[PDB]
């Protein structure tokens, strides 16, 4: 499950060339900005601002991607793609799922980095 949560191929490359400092530094930024993001997401959902939801998804997808949190990036990919069939019916669950596991994902990442080094 650590493979479905992390972008291992990307991280192993980062470690080889540069080192862990950039990941932890980047992850540090993510941990600070993330709470703000989900909150904005949650807002636009109740208010039903379609562009709102899509826009914020694009932001989290990038935020998560750069730090190697694969499942979050993927979950952001879906939220920012309103052309997908049954987006309306399933979009709310993807948001409740974003809110539910982001901290756990961050934990699994920090853990893997330590063990990795």
């Amino acid at each position: 499950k650590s493979e479905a949560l992390l972008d291992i191929p990307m991280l192993e490359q980062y470690l080889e060339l540069v080192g862990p400092k950039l990941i932890t530094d980047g992850l540090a930024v993510f941990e600070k900005m993330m709470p703000g993001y989900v909150s904005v997401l949650e807002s636009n959902l109740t208010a039903q601002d379609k562009k709102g939801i899509v826009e914020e998804g694009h932001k989290i997808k990038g935020a998560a991607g750069s730090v190697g949190l694969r499942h979050l990036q993927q979950l952001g990919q879906q939220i920012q793609s309103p052309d997908l069939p049954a987006w309306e019916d399933n979009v709310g669950e993807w948001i409740e799922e974003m809110k539910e596991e982001w901290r756990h994902d961050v934990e699994v990442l920090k853990a893997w980095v330590a063990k990795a080094t």
Binding site: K1, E97, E100, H104, D105
Partner: protein, 128 residues
């Protein structure tokens, strides 16, 4: 067993819930509430009325093993049947579950045939 028996399906957000909820509707059981993790679950369980727990192993905030442990400790529901349904098939995971007091274990992926037999086995053993 009884048809009004209350179940709680603890699973974050995967295919486990749609599968299990469906197989339960087939065996006759329609009283089924769901939870996202050990935390949410424990809260819902405080409301009482539950007679059966089915749960994953990997969930944020509180995994299935901690939830199992927390349930056994709490005397108000120390005997509540808990069945683990997880991908984890290692030696450590199965022994942990046996020690903690799991009612049963089902490895993923599983088939409707198995899950129904695992349920009907526990139903006899306990006499529901």
């Amino acid at each position: 067993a009884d048809k009004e028996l209350k179940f709680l399906v603890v699973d974050d957000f995967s295919t486990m819930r749609r599968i299990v909820r469906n197989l339960l509707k087939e065996l006759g059981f329609n009283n089924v509430e769901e939870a996202e993790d050990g935390v949410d679950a424990l809260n819902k369980l405080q409301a009482g009325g539950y007679g059966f727990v089915i749960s994953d192993w990997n969930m944020p905030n509180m995994d299935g093993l901690e939830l199992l442990k927390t349930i056994r400790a709490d005397g108000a529901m120390s005997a509540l049947p808990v069945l683990m349904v997880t991908a984890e098939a290692k030696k450590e995971n199965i022994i942990a579950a046996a020690q903690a007091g799991a009612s049963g274990y089902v490895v993923k992926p599983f088939t409707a045939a198995t899950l129904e037999e695992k349920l009907n086995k526990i139903f006899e053993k306990l006499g529901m």
